[PDB]
């Protein structure tokens, strides 16, 4: 409980809410789900001045992502979709559409904000650990055990991000990950030590 509050406090210096009208209750719910992330990662994001930008509109309507208009994201070949239609982005920045957290809301991630923030943690905090030799070996074995195998089984950075999301969303997804991907589960456990 005290740790939950600390993580929410840290997130108050990371999360940026949009200007104008937006769903305040859902944005709060999204912050609450992010507070389940281990505090070590959240503190590292804050220290790196990583902002989690919540959006009330399309990602590409933000000045800094306008360059992605019409661009097909990695792994989205054949979907008929471009960044204009994608509700979240993670990496050197994080941007998320409010209301699109759940699987099937324009994406098939277990949770939008956790998956996108995992990309930022991978890249900014852990220096692209998902491309390390260690994780590539884990990914070679377990990367096709969580579904969407033409995406999660092909890009180790996506397998990492989604496994991270399973680990931190709730107790049920945490248990599912341990059953399906035990070496990934232990890897993430040891990462958080």
């Amino acid at each position: 409980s005290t740790t939950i509050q600390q993580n929410k406090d840290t997130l108050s210096q990371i999360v940026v809410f949009p200007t104008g009208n937006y769903d305040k209750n859902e944005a709060n719910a999204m912050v609450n789900r992010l507070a389940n992330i281990d505090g070590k990662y959240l503190n590292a994001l804050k220290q790196n001045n990583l902002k989690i930008k919540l959006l009330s509109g399309k990602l590409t309507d933000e000045k800094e992502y306008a360059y992605l208009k019409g661009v097909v994201p990695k792994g989205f070949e054949g979907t008929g979709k471009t960044w204009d239609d994608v509700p979240g982005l993670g990496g050197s920045t994080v941007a998320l559409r409010i209301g699109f957290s759940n699987k099937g809301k324009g994406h098939d991630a277990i949770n939008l904000e956790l998956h996108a923030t995992a990309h930022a943690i991978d890249h900014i905090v852990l220096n692209d650990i998902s491309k390390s030799a260690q994780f590539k070996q884990i990914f070679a074995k377990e990367g096709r055990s969580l579904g969407n195998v033409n995406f999660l089984g092909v890009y180790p950075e996506e397998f990492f991000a989604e496994s991270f999301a399973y680990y931190y969303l709730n107790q049920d997804t945490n248990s599912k990950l341990k059953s399906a991907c035990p070496q990934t589960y232990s890897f993430l456990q040891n990462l958080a030590k």
Partner: peptide
Amino acid sequence: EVNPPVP
């Protein structure tokens, strides 16, 4: 770096 969610 930019990465999308699962399609």
